[PDB]
Amino acid sequence: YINIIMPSVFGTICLLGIIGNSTVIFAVVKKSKLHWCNNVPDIFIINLSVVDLLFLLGMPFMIHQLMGNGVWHFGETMCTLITAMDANSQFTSTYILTAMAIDRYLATVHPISSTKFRKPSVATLVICLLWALSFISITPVWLYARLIPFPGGAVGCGIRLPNPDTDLYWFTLYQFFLAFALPFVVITAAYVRILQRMTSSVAPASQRSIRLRTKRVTRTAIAICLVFFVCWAPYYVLQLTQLSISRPTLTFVYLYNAAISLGYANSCLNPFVYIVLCETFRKRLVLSV
């Protein structure tokens, strides 16, 4: 049952996530009357779905060396390209998710002063810059992505560091900081400031409308921070754990592969969080159906 349960989990995530991401991309493009005209939130939400779609599209290529026979069937040339492509999609989506929280912080805590630079042209410039920073961040990934000769005639895609005894630490720590630690601090800090600045002094907090607004936004802010943490903390907790580990066991391997699927689930849950928790988008989507 192990040989069939694991492919089913990855297959379900890949298919369900693509349905959600394509729904967000198609609906957002329809809303625009003139493109790049006062649609900064729309630009972030479509680029996040584009990167998440690429991450799920490249999922079967990266995971086929974990389920069937542990053999890479694409050669060394594709091993470097696919590993870098998969790593780039994870970093780009995390960066766009982080920048989306900062954009929401500016639109809520600086409603007036941020209109000077919350332009669709600036949003496109920022997103293109996040792609550049994601390519730079994955530089050690594609510089060391080489085929690894396992015992027997089988080979697999992997990372061979020039000094594996010592280079295993900075390679793991820098990805932990850039892809999990730093974004989680910024994303959580941005939303807790949103919940402390989502109203005004004049606003009648005693009215049901103001109280209902705080309840819904708090629910959305918690969900976004919790989805990112749940889907990536075990993946990076097992990343730091294996630094001391020399001979992995069956239990550790099974947990590690499940944590890999959780990372892909983040690109699957992100489009649905926007669909479920946004009344404007959800009601508009139902009307189109």
């Binding site: 998969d86 690894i148 990372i159 560091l161 390679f171 990805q175």
Partner: peptide, 17 residues
């Protein structure tokens, strides 16, 4: 259907030390 006891680094394998 194999010996899935190889060391891992990220979403790819690594040679065990």
């Amino acid at each position: 259907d194999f010996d899935m006891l190889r060391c891992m680094l990220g979403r790819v394998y690594r040679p065990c030390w």
